[PDB]
Amino acid sequence: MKYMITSKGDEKSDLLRLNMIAGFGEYDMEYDDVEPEIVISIGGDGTFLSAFHQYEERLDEIAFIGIHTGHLGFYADWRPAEADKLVKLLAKGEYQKVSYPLLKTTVKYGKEATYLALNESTVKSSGGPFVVDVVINDIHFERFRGDGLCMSTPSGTTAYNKSLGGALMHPSIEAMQLTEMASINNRVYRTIGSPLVFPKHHVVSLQPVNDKDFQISVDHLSILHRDVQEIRYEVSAKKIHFARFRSFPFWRRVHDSFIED
Amino acid sequence: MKYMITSKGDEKSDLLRLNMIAGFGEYDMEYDDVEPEIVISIGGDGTFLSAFHQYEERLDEIAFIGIHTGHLGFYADWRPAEADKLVKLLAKGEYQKVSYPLLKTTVKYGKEATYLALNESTVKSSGGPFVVDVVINDIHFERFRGDGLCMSTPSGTTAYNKSLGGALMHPSIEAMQLTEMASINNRVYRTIGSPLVFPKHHVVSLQPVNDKDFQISVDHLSILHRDVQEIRYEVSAKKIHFARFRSFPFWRRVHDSFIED
Amino acid sequence: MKYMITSKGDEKSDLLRLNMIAGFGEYDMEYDDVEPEIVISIGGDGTFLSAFHQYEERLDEIAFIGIHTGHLGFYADWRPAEADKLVKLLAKGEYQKVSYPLLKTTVKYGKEATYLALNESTVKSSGGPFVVDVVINDIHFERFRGDGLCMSTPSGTTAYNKSLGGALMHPSIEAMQLTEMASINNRVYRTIGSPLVFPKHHVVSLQPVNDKDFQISVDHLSILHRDVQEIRYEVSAKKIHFARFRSFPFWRRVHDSFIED
Amino acid sequence: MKYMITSKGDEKSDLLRLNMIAGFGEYDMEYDDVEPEIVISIGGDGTFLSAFHQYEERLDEIAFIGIHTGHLGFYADWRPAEADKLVKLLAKGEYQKVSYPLLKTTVKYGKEATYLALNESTVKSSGGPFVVDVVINDIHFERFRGDGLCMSTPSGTTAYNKSLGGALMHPSIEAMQLTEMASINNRVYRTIGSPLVFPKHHVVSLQPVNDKDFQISVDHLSILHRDVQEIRYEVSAKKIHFARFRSFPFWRRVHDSFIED
Ligand SMILES: Nc1ncnc2c1ncn2[C@@H]1O[C@H](CN(CC#Cc2nc3c(N)ncnc3n2[C@@H]2O[C@H](CO)[C@@H](O)[C@H]2O)CCCO)[C@@H](O)[C@H]1O
Ligand SMILES: Nc1ncnc2c1ncn2[C@@H]1O[C@H](CN(CC#Cc2nc3c(N)ncnc3n2[C@@H]2O[C@H](CO)[C@@H](O)[C@H]2O)CCCO)[C@@H](O)[C@H]1O
Ligand SMILES: Nc1ncnc2c1ncn2[C@@H]1O[C@H](CN(CC#Cc2nc3c(N)ncnc3n2[C@@H]2O[C@H](CO)[C@@H](O)[C@H]2O)CCCO)[C@@H](O)[C@H]1O
Ligand SMILES: Nc1ncnc2c1ncn2[C@@H]1O[C@H](CN(CC#Cc2nc3c(N)ncnc3n2[C@@H]2O[C@H](CO)[C@@H](O)[C@H]2O)CCCO)[C@@H](O)[C@H]1O
């Protein structure tokens, strides 16, 4: 089918990409980076995140595969020595697909912008602590004072979320997880402290108290947002699809990345 | 229908129980503590946990209601001033039911004992640190050295799980959450650290390394287990059913118990 | 003696300041904001931090006093109702002085700038995670990847340090405490995790790995630093002096601010 | 001088002990385990803790040395390959001594028992959560509900204290650090959460609320205490003395044990 390959852009990844293109040329496979059905990312998880965002408008037509030319990735979970086996099984096709949940982020300013996240979306201020009201399904839950907030997908829970004390969640769970960054807690200021895990259809709204300018990130992409009225989080109806050719369980990937490999 | 009322056993709860029995006597409602269809717990969450375990063999035939004669409870979420309104709406019936997930704990010793938990099940040793191998879906995930491990239901996440750094999970999510108690981490010993959230059908097995005697708790009930070969955790196929008469969202209950009320 | 009064600048603080100046006019007390021997801060801890920095070059000639016109402060630990009693005991003088340790921050760029902190100094990057080598007394201790690092004085331990998981340290201890902000830890990246407490004469050096631009804060003052070669932390030889008129123990101040009041 | 050697008791440690005794026999060195001036511990930190407690009544007459026949220890910080060099430099003598602070634990029951700790002393209940009032220098600071409390020496901060979230403190600091084990925090129950670091001469008193029976540990030794009225903690006036023959800085020992070696 139509496929394309993104590369980290160092010599090792660029050369592996060229060798895989050569191997695909021996099958009924057409290189097409406009409407691919297969997107192969060669690099690390950063490269994979960029592949996801390059093709976020055609997620339901695409199966993603990641090859890690460095250390094992949570998305780039194939080794370069298996690239030839990958070309072979990918050309034939008929592989099974695995789908992970995504996070929808809506930013309102007086209009709306929407974003999809594979890892997480975070909100911080223009320096120092900021203040946001946290509203869950239209009920005021807490006034947060601190460095920021992080809302993670299940597959993102091993990323920023983990460093913030969040739980690691198996990606078959359709949920998002909100973690705090250095909240102030004293007699006057009060937050929940604990990470919060939300099911599908719950909406978490972050609303300004004084300052209306925030730094909002979606995966690696961080942009200063001015005149923001609201940041709304919910589990997306869209999913990312992976081509899988062998069993590599999430919990084994967690073991291999954090425990020992 | 058939109903019964458990009491914390102080004067306030005992008297409220007698007044509710009097009120039920004006409707087609029969007091029956052998095969009730409605179980009302008057006290706090401890009283409610005990009601759950008193009737754990007939969970699919029972709707539970909790009245808190002290502070607001996560299970005992009705005020005593509303007991008369409760009798009224309960006698008529036709209320909606809400169901929360439960945790199945299997203890193997060379035979099996199974237990159901509404809050959590924990494993500790006979003093000092103990060592257990943690096996997830038959793959060895970590060797845990420390004080113990806690496996929580969603509604249990606001209990022991929270004090151990776990995430708070909305109880519509069919999952269990494993948290660590003071794990040892150095160059030689390694655990994940982070809480782990498992979906239905995942099995987490705790297996001895040296000592085979453990203290195992299920909700409040803690018993020394000798010659243990394995402790297996999975989300139960059984659920607890609550009678609900008004909206009291989980996230509002969290707000009211931990943020302000 | 020579004294001055800084105000938060709202009506309540401005009026209390004018009334205290009137009261001081009945004693041998001269208002002098160039070379005061007594600096009274009326507001909150932010106002007090600003008073400290306004007079950081004459710290050994000054005794500070803070009045909190809002909630109790850790520095502004006097109530406005006692301002008249304060004027009285301050005019007479001969009060005892209490001294807290300070943090010296040296920034090297190829020259040096030095700063004094009463709460803490922090280092962050120009967005996303940054990388710094942490060198303790000239031995490489860790390569830190994450959001930033915080080095706190003892009296600062109840501030940002606390929100980052640091220990609360009694201010009679001549030490500084380093805490992490969201460190990355996986098979490849490794930090200590735990807060670190350093005695006097230990030097902690933060050194760039790739990017050389950082955001450095000293108490409230945050400035972008370009072409930084090193940030060095050590307990200062200078101390801040408080005028004390009654016993208000640090641990009682902690109790009153975080437990109940 | 008079010396003795304790062994872990496995073949490797027993044989190294016999070889060191043979080497000492070539110098003016007398084996004496009643009144040694040098105590050499061969094993790990557990063996070293036991050596300390074997000779806790003659701490000011003894310099301790630890050899680790397994992984590097924080107390057993010499390698077995250097035992011959150790015998040599130890026989000559005139080495420098390094002293670490200790923790005094006083247990009152209606009489007093006192204990010295090199790592920590902890208090837990006879199962489930217990309740203790925490009194600092005779002022009630908090009512703690949870699993237990840990009071650590500086050199103990890398042990249980670290697993509980405590700060790592350089052992030149004369202090003790109190950490919580799974405290309950809700609208009704409130603790500080943060580790607390106390200077010399501060006294932290733990006092019963209901149950008067506790499990009290001092280093490895854990004993059920009945009819306890109070547990008092303070930095001891006594210190442990180490014989040092080369520079092995505490922060390098921390690096080597937790970061990489
Ligand atoms: N203080 C922080 N702590 C922890 N994580 C943080 C912090 N700040 C940002 N992040 C994560 O960085 C993601 C963006 N980043 C690409 C990626 C990724 C990724 N995805 C993962 C996943 N799902 N599980 C487990 N490791 C995952 N990584 C790893 O993260 C490290 C940092 O890249 C590298 O080892 C990656 O293999 C590039 C960032 C630099 O340009 C941003 O999305 C946010 O998550
Ligand atoms: N170190 C610990 N930290 C935190 N929680 C702990 C710890 N150790 C045990 N637990 C919890 O105690 C549950 C058993 N207990 C009855 C209950 C309950 C309960 N259930 C809750 C829920 N789901 N959400 C939020 N608060 C909930 N509580 C509250 O807990 C406090 C202690 O009861 C009281 O305020 C209760 O309203 C009786 C215990 C004494 O006999 C045991 O099941 C374990 O969870
Ligand atoms: N994410 C954070 N979490 C926690 N603290 C943070 C975070 N980021 C910065 N800080 C602290 O703010 C100090 C600067 N700030 C003035 C001050 C102070 C102060 N000093 C204290 C002390 N020693 N003990 C206990 N509470 C203390 N506060 C309180 O902090 C809150 C925030 O001011 C207010 O209740 C103050 O009474 C003004 C900041 C806004 O313009 C900066 O120095 C850093 O510490
Ligand atoms: N949940 C816990 N988490 C963390 N530590 C705990 C926990 N519970 C007890 N402890 C510590 O155990 C000490 C008693 N123990 C001997 C020792 C020691 C020691 N001392 C150290 C130091 N100062 N710094 C750094 N590592 C140090 N260790 C290491 O601890 C591990 C467990 O021994 C081993 O790697 C030892 O090298 C024997 C215990 C078994 O019989 C008890 O004193 C308490 O600290």
Side-chain angles (χ1 to χ4, degrees), chain B residues 187, chain C residues 139-143 190 192, chain D residues 72 74 249-261:
Chain B
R187 180 212 329 148
Chain C
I139 69 100
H140 176 276
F141 180 77
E142 72 190 356
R143 172 163 291 184
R190 191 98 159 251
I192 188 63
Chain D
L72 171 67
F74 273 88
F250 180 76
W251 294 125
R252 176 146 278 157
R253 237 150 50 241
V254 169
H255 173 270
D256 288 355
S257 307
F258 298 103
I259 301 296
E260 54 186 346
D261 194 3

PDB file of all heavy atoms in Angstrom, chain B residues 187, chain C residues 139-143 190 192, chain D residues 72 74 249-261:
ATOM      1  N   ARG B 187      21.082   0.710  43.905  1.00  0.00           N
ATOM      2  CA  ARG B 187      21.748   0.086  42.765  1.00  0.00           C
ATOM      3  C   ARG B 187      21.340  -1.374  42.585  1.00  0.00           C
ATOM      4  O   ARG B 187      21.341  -1.884  41.459  1.00  0.00           O
ATOM      5  CB  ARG B 187      23.266   0.196  42.937  1.00  0.00           C
ATOM      6  CG  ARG B 187      24.091  -0.419  41.822  1.00  0.00           C
ATOM      7  CD  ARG B 187      25.388  -0.957  42.390  1.00  0.00           C
ATOM      8  NE  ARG B 187      25.810  -0.157  43.533  1.00  0.00           N
ATOM      9  CZ  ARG B 187      26.482  -0.629  44.573  1.00  0.00           C
ATOM     10  NH1 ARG B 187      26.845  -1.900  44.643  1.00  0.00           N
ATOM     11  NH2 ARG B 187      26.789   0.193  45.571  1.00  0.00           N
TER      12      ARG B 187
ATOM     13  N   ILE C 139      32.799  17.065  42.643  1.00  0.00           N
ATOM     14  CA  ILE C 139      32.573  15.705  42.155  1.00  0.00           C
ATOM     15  C   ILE C 139      31.228  15.642  41.444  1.00  0.00           C
ATOM     16  O   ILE C 139      30.203  16.108  41.969  1.00  0.00           O
ATOM     17  CB  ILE C 139      32.696  14.641  43.265  1.00  0.00           C
ATOM     18  CG1 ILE C 139      31.565  14.713  44.289  1.00  0.00           C
ATOM     19  CG2 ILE C 139      34.060  14.725  43.956  1.00  0.00           C
ATOM     20  CD1 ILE C 139      30.461  13.689  44.072  1.00  0.00           C
ATOM     21  N   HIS C 140      31.248  15.091  40.232  1.00  0.00           N
ATOM     22  CA  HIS C 140      30.038  14.973  39.428  1.00  0.00           C
ATOM     23  C   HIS C 140      29.080  14.005  40.088  1.00  0.00           C
ATOM     24  O   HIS C 140      29.394  12.825  40.271  1.00  0.00           O
ATOM     25  CB  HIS C 140      30.340  14.505  38.002  1.00  0.00           C
ATOM     26  CG  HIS C 140      29.101  14.293  37.180  1.00  0.00           C
ATOM     27  ND1 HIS C 140      28.370  13.125  37.220  1.00  0.00           N
ATOM     28  CD2 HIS C 140      28.440  15.119  36.333  1.00  0.00           C
ATOM     29  CE1 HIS C 140      27.326  13.231  36.416  1.00  0.00           C
ATOM     30  NE2 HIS C 140      27.345  14.431  35.865  1.00  0.00           N
ATOM     31  N   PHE C 141      27.908  14.511  40.451  1.00  0.00           N
ATOM     32  CA  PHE C 141      26.946  13.731  41.208  1.00  0.00           C
ATOM     33  C   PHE C 141      25.826  13.165  40.352  1.00  0.00           C
ATOM     34  O   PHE C 141      25.454  12.000  40.522  1.00  0.00           O
ATOM     35  CB  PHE C 141      26.354  14.599  42.324  1.00  0.00           C
ATOM     36  CG  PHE C 141      25.337  13.888  43.160  1.00  0.00           C
ATOM     37  CD1 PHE C 141      25.735  12.977  44.126  1.00  0.00           C
ATOM     38  CD2 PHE C 141      23.986  14.129  42.980  1.00  0.00           C
ATOM     39  CE1 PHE C 141      24.810  12.302  44.888  1.00  0.00           C
ATOM     40  CE2 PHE C 141      23.041  13.467  43.745  1.00  0.00           C
ATOM     41  CZ  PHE C 141      23.444  12.562  44.707  1.00  0.00           C
ATOM     42  N   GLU C 142      25.263  13.958  39.444  1.00  0.00           N
ATOM     43  CA  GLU C 142      24.202  13.449  38.586  1.00  0.00           C
ATOM     44  C   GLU C 142      24.071  14.370  37.393  1.00  0.00           C
ATOM     45  O   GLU C 142      24.456  15.540  37.446  1.00  0.00           O
ATOM     46  CB  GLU C 142      22.863  13.355  39.329  1.00  0.00           C
ATOM     47  CG  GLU C 142      22.254  14.725  39.586  1.00  0.00           C
ATOM     48  CD  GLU C 142      21.067  14.686  40.532  1.00  0.00           C
ATOM     49  OE1 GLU C 142      20.653  13.586  40.943  1.00  0.00           O
ATOM     50  OE2 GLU C 142      20.545  15.772  40.868  1.00  0.00           O
ATOM     51  N   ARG C 143      23.515  13.830  36.314  1.00  0.00           N
ATOM     52  CA  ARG C 143      23.061  14.635  35.185  1.00  0.00           C
ATOM     53  C   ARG C 143      21.547  14.719  35.279  1.00  0.00           C
ATOM     54  O   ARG C 143      20.847  13.710  35.132  1.00  0.00           O
ATOM     55  CB  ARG C 143      23.499  14.050  33.844  1.00  0.00           C
ATOM     56  CG  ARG C 143      22.879  14.773  32.661  1.00  0.00           C
ATOM     57  CD  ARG C 143      23.617  14.483  31.360  1.00  0.00           C
ATOM     58  NE  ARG C 143      24.941  15.084  31.345  1.00  0.00           N
ATOM     59  CZ  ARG C 143      25.755  15.040  30.301  1.00  0.00           C
ATOM     60  NH1 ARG C 143      25.396  14.450  29.172  1.00  0.00           N
ATOM     61  NH2 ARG C 143      26.958  15.601  30.391  1.00  0.00           N
ATOM     62  N   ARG C 190      18.962   9.194  35.037  1.00  0.00           N
ATOM     63  CA  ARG C 190      18.948   8.810  36.451  1.00  0.00           C
ATOM     64  C   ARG C 190      19.259  10.007  37.341  1.00  0.00           C
ATOM     65  O   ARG C 190      20.319  10.622  37.205  1.00  0.00           O
ATOM     66  CB  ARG C 190      19.967   7.695  36.705  1.00  0.00           C
ATOM     67  CG  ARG C 190      19.865   7.029  38.057  1.00  0.00           C
ATOM     68  CD  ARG C 190      19.083   5.723  37.972  1.00  0.00           C
ATOM     69  NE  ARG C 190      19.373   4.844  39.100  1.00  0.00           N
ATOM     70  CZ  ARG C 190      20.065   3.715  39.015  1.00  0.00           C
ATOM     71  NH1 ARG C 190      20.529   3.273  37.857  1.00  0.00           N
ATOM     72  NH2 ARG C 190      20.290   3.008  40.119  1.00  0.00           N
ATOM     73  N   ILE C 192      18.817  11.417  41.720  1.00  0.00           N
ATOM     74  CA  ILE C 192      18.688  10.882  43.069  1.00  0.00           C
ATOM     75  C   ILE C 192      17.227  10.869  43.510  1.00  0.00           C
ATOM     76  O   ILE C 192      16.813   9.983  44.267  1.00  0.00           O
ATOM     77  CB  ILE C 192      19.578  11.680  44.043  1.00  0.00           C
ATOM     78  CG1 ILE C 192      19.609  11.005  45.414  1.00  0.00           C
ATOM     79  CG2 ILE C 192      19.116  13.143  44.151  1.00  0.00           C
ATOM     80  CD1 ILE C 192      20.212   9.617  45.390  1.00  0.00           C
TER      81      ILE C 192
ATOM     82  N   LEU D  72      28.540  -2.312  47.707  1.00  0.00           N
ATOM     83  CA  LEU D  72      28.970  -1.192  48.535  1.00  0.00           C
ATOM     84  C   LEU D  72      27.928  -0.867  49.598  1.00  0.00           C
ATOM     85  O   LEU D  72      26.725  -0.872  49.333  1.00  0.00           O
ATOM     86  CB  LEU D  72      29.221   0.035  47.656  1.00  0.00           C
ATOM     87  CG  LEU D  72      29.473   1.378  48.343  1.00  0.00           C
ATOM     88  CD1 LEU D  72      30.786   1.376  49.106  1.00  0.00           C
ATOM     89  CD2 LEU D  72      29.449   2.503  47.330  1.00  0.00           C
ATOM     90  N   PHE D  74      26.794   1.845  52.970  1.00  0.00           N
ATOM     91  CA  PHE D  74      27.030   3.195  53.451  1.00  0.00           C
ATOM     92  C   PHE D  74      27.890   3.205  54.694  1.00  0.00           C
ATOM     93  O   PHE D  74      28.584   4.195  54.952  1.00  0.00           O
ATOM     94  CB  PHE D  74      25.700   3.917  53.695  1.00  0.00           C
ATOM     95  CG  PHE D  74      25.196   4.582  52.482  1.00  0.00           C
ATOM     96  CD1 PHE D  74      24.408   3.898  51.592  1.00  0.00           C
ATOM     97  CD2 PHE D  74      25.568   5.881  52.193  1.00  0.00           C
ATOM     98  CE1 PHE D  74      23.957   4.512  50.461  1.00  0.00           C
ATOM     99  CE2 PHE D  74      25.145   6.492  51.056  1.00  0.00           C
ATOM    100  CZ  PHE D  74      24.330   5.814  50.185  1.00  0.00           C
ATOM    101  N   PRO D 249      33.900  10.589  50.207  1.00  0.00           N
ATOM    102  CA  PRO D 249      32.884  11.550  50.643  1.00  0.00           C
ATOM    103  C   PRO D 249      31.491  10.954  50.665  1.00  0.00           C
ATOM    104  O   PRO D 249      31.126  10.128  49.828  1.00  0.00           O
ATOM    105  CB  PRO D 249      32.988  12.664  49.594  1.00  0.00           C
ATOM    106  CG  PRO D 249      34.384  12.572  49.101  1.00  0.00           C
ATOM    107  CD  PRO D 249      34.680  11.104  49.068  1.00  0.00           C
ATOM    108  N   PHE D 250      30.695  11.419  51.634  1.00  0.00           N
ATOM    109  CA  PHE D 250      29.307  10.992  51.738  1.00  0.00           C
ATOM    110  C   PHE D 250      28.575  11.138  50.411  1.00  0.00           C
ATOM    111  O   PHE D 250      27.841  10.240  49.990  1.00  0.00           O
ATOM    112  CB  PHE D 250      28.611  11.808  52.826  1.00  0.00           C
ATOM    113  CG  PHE D 250      27.170  11.460  53.015  1.00  0.00           C
ATOM    114  CD1 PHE D 250      26.799  10.297  53.677  1.00  0.00           C
ATOM    115  CD2 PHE D 250      26.179  12.306  52.546  1.00  0.00           C
ATOM    116  CE1 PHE D 250      25.458   9.988  53.864  1.00  0.00           C
ATOM    117  CE2 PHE D 250      24.849  12.003  52.730  1.00  0.00           C
ATOM    118  CZ  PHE D 250      24.485  10.845  53.396  1.00  0.00           C
ATOM    119  N   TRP D 251      28.746  12.278  49.739  1.00  0.00           N
ATOM    120  CA  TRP D 251      27.995  12.478  48.509  1.00  0.00           C
ATOM    121  C   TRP D 251      28.475  11.545  47.408  1.00  0.00           C
ATOM    122  O   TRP D 251      27.690  11.186  46.521  1.00  0.00           O
ATOM    123  CB  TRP D 251      28.074  13.937  48.063  1.00  0.00           C
ATOM    124  CG  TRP D 251      27.390  14.895  49.018  1.00  0.00           C
ATOM    125  CD1 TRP D 251      27.951  15.983  49.618  1.00  0.00           C
ATOM    126  CD2 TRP D 251      26.028  14.843  49.481  1.00  0.00           C
ATOM    127  NE1 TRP D 251      27.030  16.611  50.425  1.00  0.00           N
ATOM    128  CE2 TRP D 251      25.843  15.932  50.357  1.00  0.00           C
ATOM    129  CE3 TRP D 251      24.952  13.979  49.242  1.00  0.00           C
ATOM    130  CZ2 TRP D 251      24.620  16.192  50.987  1.00  0.00           C
ATOM    131  CZ3 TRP D 251      23.737  14.241  49.868  1.00  0.00           C
ATOM    132  CH2 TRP D 251      23.586  15.338  50.729  1.00  0.00           C
ATOM    133  N   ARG D 252      29.748  11.133  47.446  1.00  0.00           N
ATOM    134  CA  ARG D 252      30.198  10.112  46.505  1.00  0.00           C
ATOM    135  C   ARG D 252      29.608   8.752  46.861  1.00  0.00           C
ATOM    136  O   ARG D 252      29.221   7.983  45.972  1.00  0.00           O
ATOM    137  CB  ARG D 252      31.732  10.053  46.471  1.00  0.00           C
ATOM    138  CG  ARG D 252      32.292   8.946  45.576  1.00  0.00           C
ATOM    139  CD  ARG D 252      33.601   9.366  44.909  1.00  0.00           C
ATOM    140  NE  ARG D 252      33.342  10.173  43.724  1.00  0.00           N
ATOM    141  CZ  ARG D 252      34.198  11.032  43.188  1.00  0.00           C
ATOM    142  NH1 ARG D 252      35.396  11.234  43.713  1.00  0.00           N
ATOM    143  NH2 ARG D 252      33.841  11.709  42.099  1.00  0.00           N
ATOM    144  N   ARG D 253      29.511   8.448  48.158  1.00  0.00           N
ATOM    145  CA  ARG D 253      28.864   7.210  48.582  1.00  0.00           C
ATOM    146  C   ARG D 253      27.407   7.183  48.146  1.00  0.00           C
ATOM    147  O   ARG D 253      26.898   6.145  47.713  1.00  0.00           O
ATOM    148  CB  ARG D 253      28.986   7.044  50.100  1.00  0.00           C
ATOM    149  CG  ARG D 253      29.671   5.745  50.513  1.00  0.00           C
ATOM    150  CD  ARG D 253      30.439   5.855  51.831  1.00  0.00           C
ATOM    151  NE  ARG D 253      29.646   6.447  52.903  1.00  0.00           N
ATOM    152  CZ  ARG D 253      29.961   7.578  53.523  1.00  0.00           C
ATOM    153  NH1 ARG D 253      31.048   8.267  53.200  1.00  0.00           N
ATOM    154  NH2 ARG D 253      29.170   8.030  54.493  1.00  0.00           N
ATOM    155  N   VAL D 254      26.720   8.324  48.248  1.00  0.00           N
ATOM    156  CA  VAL D 254      25.350   8.408  47.755  1.00  0.00           C
ATOM    157  C   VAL D 254      25.307   8.178  46.253  1.00  0.00           C
ATOM    158  O   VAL D 254      24.464   7.424  45.749  1.00  0.00           O
ATOM    159  CB  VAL D 254      24.727   9.764  48.131  1.00  0.00           C
ATOM    160  CG1 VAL D 254      23.403   9.967  47.396  1.00  0.00           C
ATOM    161  CG2 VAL D 254      24.553   9.843  49.633  1.00  0.00           C
ATOM    162  N   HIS D 255      26.204   8.844  45.514  1.00  0.00           N
ATOM    163  CA  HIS D 255      26.265   8.665  44.068  1.00  0.00           C
ATOM    164  C   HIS D 255      26.482   7.203  43.723  1.00  0.00           C
ATOM    165  O   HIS D 255      25.783   6.639  42.876  1.00  0.00           O
ATOM    166  CB  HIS D 255      27.395   9.511  43.478  1.00  0.00           C
ATOM    167  CG  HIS D 255      27.643   9.262  42.025  1.00  0.00           C
ATOM    168  ND1 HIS D 255      28.532   8.306  41.574  1.00  0.00           N
ATOM    169  CD2 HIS D 255      27.137   9.855  40.919  1.00  0.00           C
ATOM    170  CE1 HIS D 255      28.562   8.324  40.252  1.00  0.00           C
ATOM    171  NE2 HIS D 255      27.721   9.251  39.828  1.00  0.00           N
ATOM    172  N   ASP D 256      27.441   6.570  44.395  1.00  0.00           N
ATOM    173  CA  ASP D 256      27.819   5.208  44.043  1.00  0.00           C
ATOM    174  C   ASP D 256      26.715   4.211  44.373  1.00  0.00           C
ATOM    175  O   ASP D 256      26.579   3.186  43.694  1.00  0.00           O
ATOM    176  CB  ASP D 256      29.112   4.833  44.766  1.00  0.00           C
ATOM    177  CG  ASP D 256      30.336   5.544  44.208  1.00  0.00           C
ATOM    178  OD1 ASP D 256      30.229   6.264  43.189  1.00  0.00           O
ATOM    179  OD2 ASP D 256      31.420   5.374  44.804  1.00  0.00           O
ATOM    180  N   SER D 257      25.913   4.489  45.398  1.00  0.00           N
ATOM    181  CA  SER D 257      24.881   3.549  45.812  1.00  0.00           C
ATOM    182  C   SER D 257      23.574   3.722  45.056  1.00  0.00           C
ATOM    183  O   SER D 257      22.835   2.742  44.888  1.00  0.00           O
ATOM    184  CB  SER D 257      24.590   3.696  47.306  1.00  0.00           C
ATOM    185  OG  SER D 257      25.764   3.600  48.090  1.00  0.00           O
ATOM    186  N   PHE D 258      23.244   4.950  44.629  1.00  0.00           N
ATOM    187  CA  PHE D 258      21.944   5.211  44.027  1.00  0.00           C
ATOM    188  C   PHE D 258      21.991   5.669  42.580  1.00  0.00           C
ATOM    189  O   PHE D 258      20.980   5.531  41.886  1.00  0.00           O
ATOM    190  CB  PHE D 258      21.169   6.266  44.848  1.00  0.00           C
ATOM    191  CG  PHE D 258      20.873   5.826  46.252  1.00  0.00           C
ATOM    192  CD1 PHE D 258      21.606   6.317  47.314  1.00  0.00           C
ATOM    193  CD2 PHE D 258      19.896   4.880  46.501  1.00  0.00           C
ATOM    194  CE1 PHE D 258      21.348   5.893  48.607  1.00  0.00           C
ATOM    195  CE2 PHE D 258      19.633   4.454  47.788  1.00  0.00           C
ATOM    196  CZ  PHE D 258      20.362   4.960  48.842  1.00  0.00           C
ATOM    197  N   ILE D 259      23.114   6.196  42.099  1.00  0.00           N
ATOM    198  CA  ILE D 259      23.176   6.776  40.766  1.00  0.00           C
ATOM    199  C   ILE D 259      23.867   5.837  39.794  1.00  0.00           C
ATOM    200  O   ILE D 259      23.293   5.463  38.771  1.00  0.00           O
ATOM    201  CB  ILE D 259      23.870   8.158  40.805  1.00  0.00           C
ATOM    202  CG1 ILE D 259      23.117   9.119  41.730  1.00  0.00           C
ATOM    203  CG2 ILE D 259      23.948   8.762  39.408  1.00  0.00           C
ATOM    204  CD1 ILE D 259      21.718   9.435  41.271  1.00  0.00           C
ATOM    205  N   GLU D 260      25.090   5.426  40.131  1.00  0.00           N
ATOM    206  CA  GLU D 260      25.895   4.541  39.294  1.00  0.00           C
ATOM    207  C   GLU D 260      27.207   4.213  39.995  1.00  0.00           C
ATOM    208  O   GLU D 260      27.715   5.020  40.776  1.00  0.00           O
ATOM    209  CB  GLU D 260      26.174   5.190  37.935  1.00  0.00           C
ATOM    210  CG  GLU D 260      26.794   6.577  38.045  1.00  0.00           C
ATOM    211  CD  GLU D 260      26.936   7.281  36.709  1.00  0.00           C
ATOM    212  OE1 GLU D 260      26.797   6.608  35.667  1.00  0.00           O
ATOM    213  OE2 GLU D 260      27.186   8.509  36.703  1.00  0.00           O
ATOM    214  N   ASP D 261      27.778   3.049  39.713  1.00  0.00           N
ATOM    215  CA  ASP D 261      29.063   2.683  40.306  1.00  0.00           C
ATOM    216  C   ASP D 261      29.858   1.804  39.348  1.00  0.00           C
ATOM    217  O   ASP D 261      29.705   1.904  38.129  1.00  0.00           O
ATOM    218  CB  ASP D 261      28.862   1.965  41.645  1.00  0.00           C
ATOM    219  CG  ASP D 261      30.146   1.863  42.456  1.00  0.00           C
ATOM    220  OD1 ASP D 261      31.184   2.396  42.008  1.00  0.00           O
ATOM    221  OD2 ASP D 261      30.115   1.251  43.546  1.00  0.00           O
TER     222      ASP D 261
END
